[PDB]
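Design request, tokens follow.
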């Protein structure tokens, strides 16, 4: 049934639109709005721990939007809670990292952060320059594809719905969702004459390794300087915080 796959594309893109935080038109319109040298120095002089508090708050919010995205994916709520948590634990921050490329400007290597665009030197006080550089580099590689909003929506749905995640109890049910999302993505790329991006997408293991380094650093900061989380998803919170 072709209309079932067309309906799936529509529903995935709708969930993405309802959870994507900033509209692409707003991000693009703000590209000329760049932090001044005075404003960059103000961020660099902030305590590591204040920048950590700010970034942790932004990342928690971003994860929560990804959870809402997943909750609206067809069939996700029909998975058992164990498998929902397995998939979100493994993939929600990977989706956050992919979503960042929308807010990245490859021409001056800046990201939209707290209302204006700034380079990675904005984050100097965190003392994480290698991680920050890796995140910027990863956003650069995606942004060069000119990833469309529907491409991000369908691709990030597949980042989440991955039947190979260790620990799933109902692997056949996740497989069925994955196959339908794969078909939705590939059908959409053919319709829009964008199958050329398939060979240019991040290779196997690159997003995994970047996310692993990223979450490891967040866990170190949270151990040294715990933040208060506006916790909305107790089963997921319990897996990440201790
Ligand atoms: O509302 C809720 O219940 C809820 C629950 C969990 C949330 N995020 C957990 C985080 C964090 C993280 C962040 Cl975002 C900030 C500070 C410290 C961390 C730390 F690393 F300590 F966990 N990093 O990766 C994840 C993650 C989530 C799914 N897969 C990976 C957010 C909101």
């Amino acid at each position: 049934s072709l209309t079932e796959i067309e309906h799936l594309v529509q529903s995935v893109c709708k969930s993405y639109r309802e959870t994507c935080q900033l509209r692409l038109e707003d991000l693009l319109r703000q590209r000329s709005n760049i932090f001044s040298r005075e404003e960059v120095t103000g961020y660099q002089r902030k305590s590591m721990w204040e920048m950590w508090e700010r970034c942790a708050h932004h990342l928690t919010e971003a994860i929560q939007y990804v959870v809402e995205f997943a909750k609206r994916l067809s069939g996700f709520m029909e998975l058992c809670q164990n498998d929902q948590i397995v998939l979100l634990k493994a993939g929600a921050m990977e989706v956050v990292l992919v979503r960042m490329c929308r807010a990245y400007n490859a021409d001056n290597r800046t990201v939209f952060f707290e209302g204006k665009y700034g380079g990675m030197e904005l984050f100097r006080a965190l003392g994480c320059s290698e991680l920050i550089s890796s995140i910027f580099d990863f956003s650069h590689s995606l942004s060069a594809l000119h990833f469309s909003e529907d491409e991000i929506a369908l691709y990030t749905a597949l980042v989440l719905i991955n039947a190979h995640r260790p620990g799933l109890q109902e692997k056949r049910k996740v497989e069925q969702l994955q196959y339908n999302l794969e078909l939705a993505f590939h059908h959409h790329l053919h319709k829009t004459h964008r199958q050329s991006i398939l060979a240019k997408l991040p290779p196997k293991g690159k997003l995994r390794s970047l996310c692993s380094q990223h979450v490891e650093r967040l866990q170190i900061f949270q151990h040294l300087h715990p933040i208060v989380v506006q916790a909305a998803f107790p089963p997921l919170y319990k897996e990440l915080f201790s």
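Comment from the thread starter after seeing the answer: thanks! DSSP finds ten helices and three strands in the chain.
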